[PDB]
Design a protein around this nucleic acid. Structure first.
Ligand SMILES: [Mg+2]
Ligand SMILES: [Zn+2]
Lengths: 653, 1320
DNA sequence: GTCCTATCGATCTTCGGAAGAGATTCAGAG
DNA sequence: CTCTGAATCTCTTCCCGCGCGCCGTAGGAC
């Protein structure tokens, strides 16, 4: 190809074939002109050494070059590896009908939607837009509709909002480690230029919102839409593929709001009255007559689905708080209130959400998750949950704890100053005195944070769980648990040298206060190690996943039951003393290999190829079973695949 | 106390406490004094071009038997100055001219010349020059050479565990690294046999070198090993005991004599026994024959009588051998002492590997191991071996390498030759063997005493050497064969190889970086980067934790925070604020001398290996105003260890609390509080802020802005003191005062400011005045702001009023919520200037034209072109507008159209034309401009001298010799024709009218030369006829998706542009401008951002009291009282300031700049205590909790509990969204395989890359995948059938088989590999 | 100045990758 | 006299996206 003016792009192969053909022209000449052996052995060497270049330049002694020692890319350099066809153009390739933008958070989306800019939708869906303007007969054909789109005329949006009206679009970040990293959403149009993503789903992508771009793809055919809607739509993927654990796990602000809504404060406005239901609980809150975390009694009703699966509705007085009454209004009618009657936090609400999925199923769960999100945002707003430096709490015992520990370290030093302790022992004991100070500072600081709240119970003071701003965030599990708050206001503690060996004199300061220059300079030996690790690791992790999919990709589940009776045995992992995992982690949802007996003898408990779903694993936990034999894909005697029963539960379903 | 006239306009209230004894060095002396060190000639020939010339000249051929020799060099002034050069697009360079003298000798005679011909300065090349901003201009583009940091030349000893063999033991290695030439490695084999190699070639037995130097083995053994002797007298074979050779080891055998036995069999030996051994004088002793039967002999033993061998040096003895050789009369038999701990036998072991006999057989082995396939040959071998280590053409420890070598061998002196010598290698071997004998230490590799900085003035001296090295090879041959009769030096050399060498360097080297001219900080922190990469360095892909990590010698030399996280952490570092390059290139940094017990205010720079010899107190350490330490014991660092030591034990002290950081981090306030992750991301995000439209000042800073904005050279700085004569936002012109004038000059310094222009990153850079007409200015005052500055403080961003709280989730996770009030104010709008160019050529079908007569297009488009064929200035343009109506013969409308998507106002055009080619009225329009701009500024001197000279007529008329019957109405040289007599005054008149004519003739050549600069065309590339460049300015606003960041490494997209009524507002009804999320502060431990907010809030409060005191018409004496009460606030803060001396005028002029918040300094590790922020907030009428109750503008409800409100500083980053939003329906495809193009600069499709395909396969989704990688992508049929089915709305595909896979088949079948598709 | 033909067939490709595995080279001996 | 141990050499691998920026055969002979 020509480039900038009358110059051909140096198009490597044509320099290699040029080498060959020149040499061959000479060799035909010198053969027919009958040169002596030494001359033809010259040209014959130079020809063999040139065809060497053309095939796989650089397996020779040295690669040949035509610039500042750039080796020319030969054929075999075009086939292989990271810039060659197999990886670069075949296995994955660039695609039309795609676009990208910076993502930004859209709180108002229902979980299945994402907003995408009108400019992109109009430049992406063009073929479908022509397929409406001809169908309106409003444009004569492509030749006019093209112009009618270019002019961006007033009709086109009402057409676009009919084209798109339910065409799923696929959003994926990159890298995309796992299936949850491409998902489909129904688009809704936006005026701006960012892609408005749903808040809960950002966690799945590991999409942070700090300027993290995301690509979008339109699926074109009917089949690509039916696959997108049935499989990849975000509503169908509330669980992880890898472990039976939600991926909708609540966003930090949502859980902050729900924690704040459900606390009890022992003094409050409107405390102690009795109400006929959530609705007048809300009227009581919204008019400002009762505080949200005030204690109350309410009439409640709750629903249970019986042994058949049909609802029994029940009603009672409940003793609770205004905000637990309001929150009960969001829960779908089939869960027990005992799941809400407690000050909620990130673990407690994940199990809340999980139990919704356990009891109702998917379709209520996605909507309940949406409502949780909206609720948490709204009460987190009213909560005004700011952060402020007067809210960093230093336990003044910290001053004494250092002033004590410093002298005891100097006792280890004075022995050393008398030769009375060894050079190893002096060090490895001093760092334990600093550990004994550090545990004490941390413990005093967590006690002080809980200690900061005490209030008059109409007469005489009494204590309660601390409304201290940073402590709400830790105690809720929103962000920054013990290891962070310890550094913010307790002490930063011991630090490590480049070779991992521990510093003899720790950072007894904390970030509420200043580090001096040395404490700061040593602090960076931590952090720069942790960044070097990130930037170094991100290669080897990827080369690991490549090697794995590129060995696993041959498997597909391909029979129902291979017909084995063989398998392997599961127990709690008992080691180092106590059990590091229970049986219910391992065995849940495999199929039994062999008939599982009652603990004891001759009474069978589970038939010999039964899926041990949850009601079976709770039953095993009712028994004194320790070892269970189950089928495993390593033992499944299907040729060229695996049988379904040997694989067992599909974790995402 | 005094402040300069640009300080005394916004005296930043300073909270610092430590008195800054050393004021920050000019932040680019790293670069400028490197290049000055290259460009200056220096008779002490090291450093500079002159050193390189003297590295090659004199130059000669033996067969020519004549020479040419360098005498001296001159460097002419650069053909175009920087401003004009940056327009015209060439490189700013200087012509290199060299006095070469060619000397012609004769045969037979003494060498006295037949002739010698000094060529009058042969032209040698064009070396670029550095601009005073420290940047090179290389093709109009402005480029910066980052300093390299790499392993200094020297000798280095090393060892490792597990990386080698892993059986618990460690292997030791020594290297000699020259500056130029071959590396030599010595290393032991595991079995302690010693080996050597050159340049990581094959392993050789190490004595092969000592052989090659023609030591015999007997001599080698006298170089390395201690003697033990046997004397065959008083009884057969007595033995020479040196007592100290037995200690700690077991006396496993009979040694005794004469009285008390020292130590009998089986017992250790100790001091008291050695003293008894000495007191008995054990000079000879009895030992059993097993002892002598252990020995290896030192020296050669032929039988003299037969003349024939019985034993040889390092041959091993036995009783029968000892008998026959002492029986042969060799009554002194001599051997070596080799205790396994202290005297291991490694060289004898090496002589058991050794295949060599003597010198020649080793040279044979050398030449065959090094040059396999060439013949060894006695006359030929040395022409390898000497050029490995002993010849200047190929081995060279520079003066730094020799110094480091000598220091490591513990030599007394460091003025030494650059080549090795026998004893220079032997000393390395001995030191390596001492290490293996356990009596020494290995060096830490990654220590800033072993790695040295190379900067531009050294990289370019090497590349210029590569030049002279290729001229060497040409000129030697041409001289050797030449007749010497007609040749003159300009025949002998030609510039082309030098120019190739240096131009490729500055143009394209891995270190000639294109400058990040993003904002004035990013200019500087780039000019002072330290890079480990590039030629002679390591590589970003090929290093690990050993070098990325920080090291204890970094303190004060390299900033630990400011490194570009990502694939090259710590392979790039930023040279710390105060640090400096030593003479040799090692990084050295200033410390205060602690003299006995007082901190003396004198600074000594310490290199990284001077530092370990002292104990140095941390910068915070207090003093008593005499200067004794206040503390009785104090924290110091010492040997990388840190601990507490006594008062008056300590020996040096840090110079400043800023010493540990770079400017990039030194600008963060309250850095004392931040996690070093978030310090790092802060100090990296500051260098990306784009200059906003109306930039001002950070309210909380560090007082480093007053230095970054000035030293970065981008504010225009007053070269000499004077008074402002005129200002108009394009020119500023200063009547310099006569106390700093040069006597013949007009005395007037213009400053033509640069206006709207593209930065290298497309942000605009318009300088604006800060002065007023008639205002006085002093040398070094800022006259004009740069981009991102105001009043000469750095000012990247805008001091936006932020409150920390959740808001319905719009600021979830990280996002920033923003009020419409900020965008309405044009707070963050920013101007992006693109350059588009239309080239035109003398193509093969014929020459192009620029015209409006374009074929196939009507006035519907052409309405914006003028009649010449270029767009009007001030045309506002959009996609597809024709900017330049180029056309090609045989007529084709190829014309410059504005690319898709972009839009803007055409702010300027430029036109460039070859020689011998016609202009047009847009070239004449530009000539009219530039001529007039030169002529005006010249006239404003000629006018000033004319006025002075006519005064110099008038005054000496009017004062005496008056002729003023009529005077001032007349032409003031027609004043000569008045009738004054031939007394001296008429001769003064005649002479000073001739001085007036010559004053006209003076400018009569100066303006001609200037107009000749403008009249000419330009040095176009071959093929082009002319080029025109057209600039589009876009005023981009701010919108969802744009990125903003704080200084603390907090960052977000802005997520919604909320209308004012929805912002929270306070109990006074002012809404907040931004709502940040709180949870990021504990979760990422960057709580310094809260104290910036509170101190920012107080900063607003003082302006709030001042603005009220200016709306109310308070008298200055009350106003001065409040301002003074603000500056004196706090503890014993460093600064003192007396508004009593500000003359009221300047008190109002000060107030008029505080009236939007008092600016504050919080120097990095020395900031305000909390108790001083509270104190300032109490001086304002503000709530000292810092928090305020807020209400929600959606309802007017109160928020529960107050929330933080205050003035953070926020930067718009250059990652703004419309520069990234992209989408493609269909368009281009690549040629080799039909997959879509990739880009925004091309209308590309996103890569559905490898990992996404596994992601689809992991759903069941097969049809989606089939589509994505065929129909949507590659199948040349199917995609056009798909498109039509979609416009038909059929929703069906025909999938085929991708053409990229057919490419593969042919690319395999283009090997002799028959791959084929198969049927069943 | 343009067109055609060839590369260090009279040097010196960078030491600062680790690894990890194979092909290919050598011990102590039956 | 070469057979299983081990020893030195080369070959091969090293995240995914993305955006800029520039830079892009020579020398000799007719
Ligand atoms: Mg991110
Ligand atoms: Zn099976």
């Amino acid at each position: 190809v020509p480039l900038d003016g009358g110059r051909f792009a140096t198009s490597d192969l044509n320099d290699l074939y040029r080498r060959v053909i020149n040499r061959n022209n000479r060799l035909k000449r010198l053969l027919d002109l009958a040169a002596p052996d030494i001359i033809v052995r010259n040209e014959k060497r130079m020809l063999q050494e040139a065809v060497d270049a053309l095939l796989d330049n650089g397996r020779r002694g040295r690669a040949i070059t035509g610039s500042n020692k750039r080796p020319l890319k030969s054929l075999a350099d075009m086939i292989k590896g990271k810039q060659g066809r197999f990886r670069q153009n075949l296995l994955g390739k660039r695609v039309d009908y795609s676009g990208r933008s910076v993502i930004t958070v859209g709180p108002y989306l229902r979980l299945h939607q994402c907003g995408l800019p009108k400019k992109m939708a109009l430049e992406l869906f063009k073929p479908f837009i022509y397929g409406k303007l001809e169908l309106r007969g409003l444009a004569t054909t492509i030749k006019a509709a093209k112009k009618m789109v270019e002019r961006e005329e007033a009709v086109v949006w009402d057409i676009l909002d009919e084209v798109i009206r339910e065409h799923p679009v696929l959003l994926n970040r990159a890298p995309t480690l796992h299936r949850l990293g491409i998902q489909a959403f129904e688009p809704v149009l936006i005026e701006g230029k960012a892609i408005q993503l749903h808040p809960l789903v950002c966690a799945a992508y590991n999409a942070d919102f700090d300027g993290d771009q995301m690509a979008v793809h339109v699926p074109l055919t009917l089949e690509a839409q039916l696959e997108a809607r049935a499989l990849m739509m975000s509503t169908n993927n509330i669980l992880s593929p890898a472990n039976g654990e939600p991926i909708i796990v609540p966003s930090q602000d949502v859980v902050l709001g729900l924690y704040y809504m459900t606390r009890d404060c022992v003094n409050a406005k409107g405390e102690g009255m009795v109400l006929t239901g959530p609705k007048e609980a809300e009227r009581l809150y919204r008019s400002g007559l009762a505080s949200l975390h005030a204690r109350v009694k309410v009439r409640i009703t709750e629903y249970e689905k019986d042994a058949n699966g049909e609802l029994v509705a029940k009603t009672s007085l409940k003793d609770t708080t205004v905000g637990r009454a309001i929150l009960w209004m969001i829960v779908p009618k089939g869960l027990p209130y005992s799941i809400v009657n407690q000050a909620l936090g990130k673990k407690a609400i994940s199990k809340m959400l999980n139990t919704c999925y356990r009891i109702l199923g998917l379709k209520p769960t996605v909507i309940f998750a949406d409502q949780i999100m909206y609720t948490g945002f709204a009460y987190a707003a009213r909560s005004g949950a700011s952060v402020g430096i007067d809210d960093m709490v230093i336990p003044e015992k910290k001053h004494e704890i250092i002033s004590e520990a410093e002298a005891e370290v100097a006792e280890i030093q004075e022995q050393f100053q008398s030769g009375l302790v060894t050079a190893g022992e002096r060090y490895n004991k001093v760092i334990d005195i600093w550990a004994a100070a550090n545990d004490r500072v941390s413990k005093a600081m967590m006690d002080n944070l809980q200690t900061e709240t005490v209030i008059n119970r109409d007469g005489q003071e009494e204590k309660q769980v601390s409304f201290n701003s940073i402590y709400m965030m830790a105690d809720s599990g929103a962000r920054g648990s013990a290891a962070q708050i310890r550094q913010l206001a307790g002490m930063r503690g011991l630090m490590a040298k480049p070779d991992g060996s521990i510093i003899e004199t720790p950072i007894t300061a904390n970030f509420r206060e200043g580090l001096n220059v040395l404490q700061y300079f040593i602090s960076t030996h931590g952090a720069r190690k942790g960044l070097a690790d990130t930037a170094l690791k991100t290669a080897n992790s990827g080369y690991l996943t490549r090697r794995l999919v590129d060995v696993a990709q041959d498997l597909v589940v391909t029979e129902d039951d291979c017909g084995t009776h063989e398998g392997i045995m599961m127990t709690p992992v008992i080691e180092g003393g106590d059990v590091k995992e229970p049986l219910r982690d391992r065995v849940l949802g495999r199929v039994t290999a062999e008939d599982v007996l009652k603990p004891g003898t001759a009474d069978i408990l589970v038939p010999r190829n039964t899926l041990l779903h949850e009601q079976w694993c709770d039953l095993l936990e009712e028994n004194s079973v320790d070892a269970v034999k189950v089928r495993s894909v390593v033992s499944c005697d299907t040729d060229f695949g695996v049988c379904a029963h040997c694989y067992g539960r599909d974790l995402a379903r | 106390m005094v402040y300069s006239y640009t300080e005394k306009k916004r005296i930043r209230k300073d909270f610092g406490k430590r008195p800054q004894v050393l004021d920050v060095p000019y932040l680019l002396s790293i670069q400028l004094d490197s290049f000055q060190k290259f460009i200056e000639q220096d008779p002490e020939g090291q450093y500079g071009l002159e050193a390189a010339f003297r590295s090659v000249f004199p130059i000669q051929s033996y067969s020519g038997n004549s020479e040419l020799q360098y005498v001296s060099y001159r460097l002419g002034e650069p053909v175009f100055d920087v401003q004009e050069c940056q327009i015209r697009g060439v490189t700013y360079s200087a012509p290199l001219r060299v006095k070469l003298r060619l000397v012609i000798y004769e045969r037979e005679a003494p060498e006295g010349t037949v002739k010698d011909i000094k060529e009058q300065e042969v032209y040698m090349g064009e070396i670029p020059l550095m601009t005073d901003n420290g940047t090179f201009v290389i093709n109009g583009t402005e480029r910066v050479i980052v300093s390299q940091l790499h392993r200094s030349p020297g000798v280095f000893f090393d060892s490792d565990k597990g990386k080698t063999h892993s059986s618990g033991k460690v292997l030791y290695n020594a290297r000699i690294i020259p500056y130029r030439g071959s590396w030599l490695d010595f290393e032991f084999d595991p079995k302690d046999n010693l080996f050597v190699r050159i340049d990581r070639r094959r392993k050789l037995p190490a004595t092969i070198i000592l052989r090659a130097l023609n030591y015999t083995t007997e001599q080698i053994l006298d170089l390395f090993f201690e003697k033990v002797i046997f004397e065959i007298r008083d009884n057969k074979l007595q033995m020479e005991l040196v007592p100290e050779r037995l200690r700690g080891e077991t006396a496993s055998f009979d040694i005794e004599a004469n009285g008390k036995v020292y130590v009998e069999k089986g017992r250790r030996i100790t001091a008291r026994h050695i003293r008894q051994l000495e007191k008995d004088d054990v000079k000879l002793i009895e030992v059993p024959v097993e002892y002598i039967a252990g020995k290896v002999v030192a020296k050669d033993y032929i039988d003299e009588s037969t003349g024939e061998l019985i034993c040889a040096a390092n041959m091993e003895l036995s009783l029968d051998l000892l008998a026959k050789l002492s029986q042969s009369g060799h009554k002194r038999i001599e051997t070596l002492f080799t205790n396994d701990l202290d005297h291991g036998p490694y060289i004898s072991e090496t002589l058991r590997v050794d295949p060599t006999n003597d010198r020649l057989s080793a040279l044979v082995e050398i030449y065959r191991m090094m040059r396999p396939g060439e013949p060894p040959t006695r006359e030929a071998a040395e022409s390898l071996f000497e050029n490995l280590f002993f010849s200047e053409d190929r081995y060279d420890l520079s003066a730094v390498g020799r110094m480091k070598f000598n220091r490591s061998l513990l030599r007394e002196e460091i003025e030494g030759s650059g080549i090795l010598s026998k004893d220079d290698i032997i000393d390395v071997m001995k030191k390596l063997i001492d290490i293996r004998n356990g009596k020494g230490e290995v060096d830490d590799i990654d220590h800033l005493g072993n790695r040295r900085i190379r900067s531009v003035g050294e990289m370019a001296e090497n590349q210029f050497r590569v030049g002279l090295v290729r001229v060497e090879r040409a000129v030697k041959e041409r001289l050797s064969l030449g007749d010497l009769d007609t040749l003159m030096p300009q025949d002998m050399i030609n510039a082309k190889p030098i120019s190739a060498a240096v131009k490729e360097f500055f143009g394209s080297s891995q270190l000639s970086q294109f400058m990040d001219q993003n904002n004035p900080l990013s200019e500087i922190t780039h000019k002072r980067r330290i890079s480990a990469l590039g030629p002679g360095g390591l590589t970003r892909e090929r290093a690990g934790f050993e070098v990325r990590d920080v090291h204890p010698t970094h303190y004060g030399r390299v900033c630990p925070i400011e490194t570009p996280e990502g694939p090259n952490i710590g392979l790039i570092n930023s040279l710390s604020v105060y640090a400096q390059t030593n003479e040799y290139g090692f990084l050295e940094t200033p410390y205060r001398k602690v003299t006995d017990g007082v901190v003396t205010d004198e600074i000594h720079y310490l290199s990284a290996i001077e530092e370990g010899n002292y104990v140095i107190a941390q910068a915070n350490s207090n003093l008593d105003e005499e200067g004794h330490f206040v503390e009785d014991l104090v924290t110091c660092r010492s040997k990388g260890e840190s601990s507490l030591f006594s008062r008056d034990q300590v020996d040096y002290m840090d110079v400043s609390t800023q010493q540990v950081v770079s400017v990039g981090a030194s600008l963060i306030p309250f850095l004392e509080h931040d996690d070093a992750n978030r310090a790092l991301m802060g100090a990296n995000m500051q260098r990306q802020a784009v200059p906003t439209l109306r930039a001002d000042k950070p309210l909380v800073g560090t007082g480093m802005e007053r230095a970054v904005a000035v030293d970065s050279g981008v504010t225009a700085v007053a070269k000499r003191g004077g008074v402002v004569q005129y200002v108009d936002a394009s020119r500023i012109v200063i009547k310099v005062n006569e106390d700093e004038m040069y006597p013949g000059e007009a005395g007037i310094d213009i400053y033509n400011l640069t206006k709207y222009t593209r930065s290298n990153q497309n942000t605009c850079i318009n300088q604006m005045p800060c002065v007023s007409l008639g205002e006085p200015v002093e040398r070094g005052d800022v006259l004009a702001d740069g981009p991102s500055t105001d009043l000469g403080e750095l000012a990247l961003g805008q001091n936006m009023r932020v409150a920390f709280m959740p808001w319905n989730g719009y600021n979830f996770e990280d996002s920033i919520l923003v009020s419409e009030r900020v965008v309405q104010e044009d707070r963050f709008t920013t101007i992006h200037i693109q350059e588009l160019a239309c080239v035109s050529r003398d193509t093969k079908l014929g020459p192009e034209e620029i015209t409006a007569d374009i074929p196939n297009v009507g006035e519907a488009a052409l309405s914006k072109l003028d009649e010449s064929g270029i767009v009007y200035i001030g045309a506002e343009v959009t996609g597809g507008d024709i900017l330049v109506g180029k056309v090609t013969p045989k007529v084709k409308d190829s014309s410059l159209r504005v690319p898709n998507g972009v839009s803007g106002t055409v702010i300027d055009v430029q036109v460039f034309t070859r020689d011998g080619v016609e202009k047009d009225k847009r070239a004449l329009e530009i000539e009219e401009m530039q001529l007039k701009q030169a002529k005006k500024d010249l006239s404003e001197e000629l006018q000033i001298l004319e006025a002075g000279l006519f005064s110099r007529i008038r005054a000496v008329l009017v004062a005496g010799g008056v002729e003023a019957e009529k005077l001032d109405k007349l032409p003031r040289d027609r004043w000569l024709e008045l009738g004054l007599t031939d007394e001296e005054k008429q001769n003064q008149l005649e002479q000073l009218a001739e001085q007036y004519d010559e004053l006209k003739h003076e400018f009569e050549k100066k303006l001609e030369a200037k107009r000749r600069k403008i009249t000419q065309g330009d040095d176009l590339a071959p093929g082009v006829l002319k080029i025109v460049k057209v600039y589009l300015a876009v005023k981009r606003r701010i919108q969802p998706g744009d990125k903003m960041a704080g200084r603390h490494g907090n960052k977000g997209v802005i997520s919604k542009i909320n209308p004012i009524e929805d912002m929270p507002y306070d109990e006074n009804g002012t809404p907040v401008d931004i709502v940040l999320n709180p949870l990021g502060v504990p979760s990422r431990m960057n709580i310094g951002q809260i104290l910036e907010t509170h101190l920012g809030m107080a900063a607003k409060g003082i302006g709030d009291k001042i603005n009220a005191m200016l709306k109310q018409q308070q008298e200055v004496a009350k106003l001065r009282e409040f301002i003074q009460r603000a500056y004196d606030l706090g503890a014993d803060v460093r600064q003192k300031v007396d508004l009593s001396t500000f003359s009221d005028e300047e008190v109002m002029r000060l107030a008029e700049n505080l009236r939007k918040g008092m600016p504050i300094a919080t120097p990095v590790f020395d900031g305000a205590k909390e108790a001083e922020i509270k104190e300032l907030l109490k001086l304002g009428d503000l709530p000292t909790s810092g928090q305020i109750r807020l209400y929600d503008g959606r309802t007017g409800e109160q928020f529960e509990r107050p929330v933080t409100v205050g003035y953070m500083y926020m930067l718009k980053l250059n990652h703004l969204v419309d520069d990234k939003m992209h989408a493609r329906s269909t368009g281009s495809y690549s040629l080799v395989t039909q997959q879509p193009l990739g880009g925004k600069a091309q209308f590309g499709g996103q890569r559905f890359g490898e990992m996404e395909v596994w992601a689809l396969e992991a759903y069941g989704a097969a049809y989606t995948l089939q589509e994505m990688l065929t129909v949507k992508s590659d199948d040349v049929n199917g995609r056009t059938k798909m498109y039509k089915n979609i416009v038909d709305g059929n929703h069906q595909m025909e999938p085929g088989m991708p053409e990229s896979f057919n490419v593969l088949l042919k690319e395999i079948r283009s090997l002799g590999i028959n791959i084929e598709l198969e049927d069943e």
